[PDB]
Amino acid sequence: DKATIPSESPFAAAEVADGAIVVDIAKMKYETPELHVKVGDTVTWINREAMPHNVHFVAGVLGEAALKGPMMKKEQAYSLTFTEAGTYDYHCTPHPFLRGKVVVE
Ligand SMILES: [Cl-]
Ligand SMILES: [Cu+2]
Ligand SMILES: [Zn+2]
């Protein structure tokens, strides 16, 4: 697989450090739609609104199985560590037009 999961379930956003790599979700947008990171970087998504959101990498992107992240409520967060160089599209399961990309160098 091309990523690992620090926490299988969402956790409180308050636990994320200032300066951690963070993608906010708000107004139906991933606030960094094309994120550039390095191999071994841990990316954390944080939902800032009441509409629940997840991240969903389809089969073939991070492995042979889809990675369907858990739904995050407001002020919940979810992380992935990218372990292999590449480019990875993802979207929100319920809202396929809310989508983004992680570029791992
Ligand atoms: Cl499926
Ligand atoms: Cu969503
Ligand atoms: Zn909905």
Swiss-Prot record:
List of residues binding Cu cation: H53, C92, H95, L98
S-S bonds: none
Cofactor binding note: Binds 1 copper ion per subunit.
Coiled-coil regions, chain positions: none
Pathway: One-carbon metabolism; methylamine degradation
Domain (Plastocyanin-like): residue spans on this chain: 1-105
Superkingdom of this protein's organism: Bacteria
Any one of the GO CC terms: periplasmic space
Alphabetic keyword roster: Copper, Electron transport, Metal-binding, Periplasm, Signal, Transport
Cofactor entry: Cu cation
UniProt GO MF annotations: copper ion binding; electron transfer activity
Function: Primary acceptor of electrons from methylamine dehydrogenase. Passes those electrons on either a soluble cytochrome c or to pseudoazurin.
Protein's name according to its UniProt entry: Amicyanin
Annotated source species: Paracoccus denitrificans
